[PDB]
Each structure stands twice: as C-alpha cells, then as structure tokens.
Amino acid sequence: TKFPKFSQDLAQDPTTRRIWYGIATAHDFETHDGMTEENLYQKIFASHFGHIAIIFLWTSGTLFHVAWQGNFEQWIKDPLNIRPIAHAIWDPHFGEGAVNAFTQAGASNPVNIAYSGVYHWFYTIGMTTNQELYSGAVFLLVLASLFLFAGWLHLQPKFRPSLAWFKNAESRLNHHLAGLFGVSSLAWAGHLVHVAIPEARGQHVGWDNFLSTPPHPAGLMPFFTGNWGVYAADPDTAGHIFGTSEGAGTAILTFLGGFHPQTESLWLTDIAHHHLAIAVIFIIAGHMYRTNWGIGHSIKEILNAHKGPLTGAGHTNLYDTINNSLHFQLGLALASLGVITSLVAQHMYSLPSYAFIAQDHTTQAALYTHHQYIAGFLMVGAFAHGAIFFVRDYDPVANKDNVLARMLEHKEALISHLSWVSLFLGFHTLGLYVHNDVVVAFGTPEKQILIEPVFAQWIQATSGKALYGFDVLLSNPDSIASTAWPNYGNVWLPGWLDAINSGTNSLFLTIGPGDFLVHHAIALGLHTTALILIKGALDARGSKLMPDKKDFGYSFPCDGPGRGGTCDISAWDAFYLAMFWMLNTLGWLTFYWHWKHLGVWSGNVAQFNENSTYLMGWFRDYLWANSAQLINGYNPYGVNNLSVWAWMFLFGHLVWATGFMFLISWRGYWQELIETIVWAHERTPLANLVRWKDKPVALSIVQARLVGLAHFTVGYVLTYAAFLIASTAGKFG
Amino acid sequence: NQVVQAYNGDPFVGHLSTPISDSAFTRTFIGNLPAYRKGLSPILRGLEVGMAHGYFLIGPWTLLGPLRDSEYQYIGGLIGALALILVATAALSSYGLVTFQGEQGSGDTLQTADGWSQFAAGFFVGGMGGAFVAYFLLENLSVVDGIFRGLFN
Amino acid sequence: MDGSYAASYLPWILIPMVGWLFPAVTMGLLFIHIESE
C-alpha cells in the first residue's frame, strides 16, 4: 500500500506479489512514477556514488581484516610456508573439534585461510606492515565517506546536473580516457617507481621519506633532457631476492619481458614501464573529442561519415541511438567489461604479476574461476541489455537502414547459422567424446579419435615455444620477427623466450589432444549461449508466434496457451536459458583449467593428457578422484580444516536441487496448494486470531523462473567454489 | 535551502524546526518511542518504558557501589535498582493522582487518570522485570560468556 | 572462540548484534514499513 512507492500499480494489489515485485522493480528507474529523463539520470548518478562507496567499504573491510585478524606480519617472512589468514572465525556453534581443526596457519583463534590473494597483492605493491594496511583501511573509509557525500550532494537541487551534462559524450570520453584511464595509470606507475620497486629492492619509502628519497640516483633532469637510458641502466639481476637488497639494480623502468626468477612473477620495473606506456597512450587518446575549445572530433561526424554500399545508411543516426539509450550504453559497457574480465582471468594465471602467487595454487585457482564467472555474468548481462534496448529504447524510424536496422532485417539468417554451428560443433564434440568413451570402455584405447590441436600449437610456436618442432616466427631465431632486422629492438625477447620455454610456469601451457576437444566444447558453449542471447535480443521485438512483444515488455510471463502454447517467449526467458548455458560453459572451462593445472602443479601431466579424451576419464580422475579429500572433511572419526568446504559442497547441492523445484514445478500446483493452506489457517482455532494483511499467493511465473535461476546459480557457484578450493588446498597446502 | 523553519508552519509558537528537533529521522524516532507511538494501550508502552530503565539502573551500583568489592556485587546493584524503581513508581502514581483529577478528554489515552494508572502499572512491571533480568544476566555471567564463545556448544 | 588479536571482546558483542539485532531490527522496521498505510 505504501512500500512500492515508486509504482502506484503495485501499491494496490492486496497480495504478497507487491512485496516481491517491489523488491524487483526498485532499481528499474525507467518504470517509476513521475520519472522524467533528467530525474532518471540524476538518480542513476547518485546510485553510482553509493555503489562506489560500497566498493570502497568492501576493500576497506578486506584491508581491515587482513590488518586486524590476519597474519600479514608473519606471512611476509616466508610467504611460501605460511598460509595467509583472511579473518577470524567467531561463531558460538563450534565444538571443540572444529575449534582445534580451524586453528591453522599459526594462530590461536580459529581462522579462515585467505584464497582471494590480497596478501600477495599487498606484498607486491609495497605494503609490509599492519600499520600500512590500517592506514589504507582508514583512508578508504574516508574515501567512501567522500563518495557518499558526493552522491548526497548531487541529489541537492543546486548541484543536480542538467540533462545536457549527462548527454555530453565527448567530454566524458576525454576525461575518462585521459583523466581516469591515463592519469590513474600514470599515478600507479608513480607508486610503482616510488614505493613498490624500492621496497621490493629493500628500502622503506613511506610517506615520510617519500620526498627525501628519489627513486633513482639520477634525478628528473635525465627525464627532461631526453637521455632516458639511465632509467634502464642496470636491471634487476636474475639472483634478486624480493623485499631485500641483493643485486637490486636501481633501474626504475626496464623491459626484460620475462619472469622474476624468485617470485615467479613479472618484474615490478616491467610493470611500471608498462603503466607508463599505457598512461602515455591513454592520455593522448583523451585529446580526441571536441569540447569547449576548437580542436578534436565530433562523434556524430565520425559515425555519420561511415556509409558504404554494402550497408547503405551505414552508421547514420547512431550517435543519438547510443546517447539517448541507457540500455545500449549499459550493454556496451557490460560487453567490454566481460571481455576484459575474461582477459584478466586468462592473463593473471599465465602472466602472474604478484609475488609468490604462482606458487600459491589455491588462490590462483580461485582468482581464475572468480573472474571467469564474473566475465560470463557480465557478457550475459550485456546481451540482456541488448534485448532490453531492442524492447524499450529502439526506434526503427531514426534507425532506418543503418547497421541496427540491418541486424533486425536478417536476424533469421544469423540465428539459423548460429543454430547450425552450435548443432554441428555439439554433435561432433559429443560424438568424439562418446566414441572415445565407448572404445576405451571396450578395452581398446588405441581406437580413440585423438586430434592434434595443431593450430594452437602453431600459435604457441609463433610466440616462441619451440617444443613442437615448428620454426616459424619466434621459434626460428633467423626469422624476420625474432631478429627484428631494422632495429633489433627485441629487448623483451631473451627473457620472454627463457620464460615461455621453461616447463614450470603456466605461461603457454603444453596443449595436446585432450585440449582440442575441450576447446571445441568451450566453443560450443560460447556459441549456444550466444545463440540464446541473440535469439532473445533480436526476437525481443517479436517473432511470428507473437508479432507484438514490445508492448508486453521485457519480462512478461507468457502469452497464454493459445497459438500452440507460448510458455517462455519473452526475451527475459532467453536470458534465463542462456544463464543456464553460461553456467554450463563456465563449468566446462573451469573444470578444464582446474584439471589441467592439477596435472601441471603436481607434475603428473600424463593423467590429464591420457585421461581427458573420454568422459569417464573426466568423471573418475577428476570428479571422483579429487573429491576424496573433500567429502572426508568431516567423517565420524573427526574434523579437519576442509570441513566448512564439505559443508558448503552439500549446501550447494541442496540449493541446486531447490532450484530444480522452482524450475520444474509451476505456479498452478502451488497456487491451489496455498489455497488449501489458507483454508487451514482461516478455519482453525487459536490461529484465526492472526490474519494476513497481504493475501498469500504463489510466486509469479517469471518471478519463480528468476528464483529457480538464482538457486541454480548460487548452489552451482557454492558447490564449485567448495570443490575447487578444497581440492587444491587438499593437496597443495 | 533553509533548514531551520518555524515549528509546524506556525511562526509564533516558541519553537524552531531545527534538524534535531523537527527532522524526518527525529519525527520517525521520537514519534515511535513508547511515550509517543500511535495506537498502543498505556500498559504496553509503560511496560516497554519500564524495561528500558530497569535494565539500565542495574549497572551504576553494580560497578560503582558499596558492594562492588565483595562477593555480593550484583545483589547490591539489584537492591539499589529495586529501591529506585519503587520510588519511581511511587512518584509516577502520585503524579497520576495529582495531575489527573480534573476531568479531561481522551485525545491521548496516556494523559488521563486511567491511562496514567495503566502507564504506572506497566512501568512498575517492566522496571522490576528489567532490573531482575539484568541481575540474572550479571549473576550468571560465566554462563553467558561461555554460550557466546562456545564453551558448552 | 578465544581471541588472540586486539579487542577480542568486539566480535563477542558484534556477532550477536549483526546476527540478531541487525536482522530483528531490520526485519521489524521493514515489516512495519512494507505494511504501513
């Protein structure tokens, strides 16, 4: 009656549907009552400020619990031996067995071992005492306070920006490319050369000797005179020990391009030089778009001048399409962020840049799986907001004959081709897996279809991995690429070739016939998830089953049992199905990564290389073999430290099967069941006294599709996090 | 952007609408204390006021009392708190006997003789109950410590 | 649950409050709020 104050149509139904739909609709600011575009944008802006403060309070809490309850002082003595403590366990339910089991990593209290890798990150960026982390945590509390005050300030009518301020794409691109992506990268290169590189070489550069101690014995006058070679004078020698001065070198910017031979990570000077180059390129890229002064570009001119014969209108009227639509902007942002979160995951495991994080295996597994799951979620959200844009903000009159109109003008062709490629690739990946499985089971493993993944092996050979016998570009030192004949500027190449050809690191893993089939399974998952997502994006405006879906919106339940039956026709239901396929694909690739690295870390790579080509190899050497240490986390004899992970394993199974309840059984059964329960309550003595204000109804169709999806997701993630974190910590620390 | 208006739009009443006296948080919080909450019978608001003060008055004599350095540390605090709640309820009922003798309306159910008598009764029950429950937690402090830390679980 | 770290009484008081007082108070206020008027 009062709760969903943003929508009067929800403050009228006397059911529990208004509670559920108030919680769900609360952030869809476009559908609130009394909403103009200006109030939309200002409310969005202050919501962003609140969320920035959420992020800063979260990292403040991580810092404060590493500082207060963690063994950061002890861990930076020998990071290889001591496990990093995340925070302290305090619940009154623990028996004596659990308290003695969870006392670990040199503590008195029960503690949680940190698998987020924040210890390695804080140790690499130069933080070496609990007081430094406490100062960082209080500083981030103050920064979060500042952003909360900024959000409250920009809700004040004097400081509320106009619509022309929010619709200013060129100035925002200038200040984000230059001032946010370039100045922050420059400032990080400054922290690296002033604090992280010197304290990696031994000396303390705090806030007190910050100005008194130059990073280089040469001042900034060599930087101004152009003689920049002194900053790369003597690099860190290959016998350098992190945190102390043995063969330091005193070169703040070098480009060795290999790995540190002791921390197994990249050199901090190489990181600083990288961020300096990135800052220079991003700063000059932020001077591209027109602003109050005369020079620059206007994006409308750039877009509208790209008209070809094979598209016709080209990109005409795409500036107003992107600028006026917030779901287009959110789809582009989520697509790029999902791509670069995949990129973060794929590069932080093969090119680690933190001290001793390539030798702590559980945190590397947790970080990879975490960022690949975030990347899958963000990519699915990009396509979800593509569908929401096509429903809500898409104008087929202004977007006449441009690239968007021609996306929708042939959607059947590309949906049918995604159908063909996903069917083709799925038929033959399952065919090869079932063939290998059947002929291995029939006692004849020599009959397997084992395909050498020659293309990726050739890619590795082009990057310098000389194991496979190709001598093409960098594996052939006589070639034009390896010598770089005009200048011989390959300063990175000796270090890179020394790092790619060592069998220890995860940089360019050896790829065999078991990797071919899982890459094609991953391609199948990507293609089928993309098929469902674009089949919801392009059919959001209507198919022949329902030529008007733009008027029912994004997430209507169905269209009745007529027209044959119309159960999951909304674009939201294509989100739903592609959410399942995303979870499957990320399960496939994280299963593959996990088993490949359990082979690599243990040294017994033969297990993956012969047993990953058929499905019971995946089932008995990975799922069954590696859960042995998991389910024995608590047995009738006792309890060890992998007991909360066994409990989370079972917990995730339970959440998953409850998701099955919501996805399989549908609303009619539950509505008549609740009708019987309502009769029971209204007709019993002593409980007639208590009456509902909101009449109990079953969850809606789309609501319980969402709830089953949430259960499937949460149980799926909790089960796999428990398994992946207890299987590595079962056998690696 | 003025934050200090007059009270309730009346510029001649002797009150300002400052951010402490007449804010939204103050209206929703002061106006939802038991002394001001809407619809409550006087017995329940007196009971809720009473427990908040019986639980309070245990502490000052328990930690700072003539018995704070003996084995009957909590019994002296409880005895002092019962003395204070007794004289508090005697004062409350005397105030009810005095103020509400001339007949008045029923715009507020608390500002009447039956309403103030119910308030005093609820205050007595709540005050002595809160005093005894704070005594019971303080006397059995080893038990509460052990169950919050997990010495018996 | 002994606490070796600094201010071990602080989790002793903050686990009941975040476990009970924050949920009981938050659900009580939200129950008054979503059902008001």
């Binding site: 609990n130 406490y134 509390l141 005050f149 | - | 770290y5």
Partner: peptide, 30 residues
C-alpha cells in the same frame, strides 16, 4: 600486531560513512 585502540578508532571513523550513507540513501528515497 595491531593496537586495541586502533580498532575502536577505525570504528568511530567508520561511523562517518554510516551517517553519510544513511543520509545519501534517505535522499535517494526522495
């Protein structure tokens, strides 16, 4: 290690984001 009063100092500092978050969320509710 870390001090006893640094934790309480962090708590009374974080009382300021609490107040500002309460006031920002209240102002968003309008």
């Amino acid at each position: 290690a870390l001090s006893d009063t640094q934790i309480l100092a962090a708590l009374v500092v974080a009382l300021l984001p609490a107040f500002l978050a309460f006031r920002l969320s209240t102002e968003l509710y309008k």
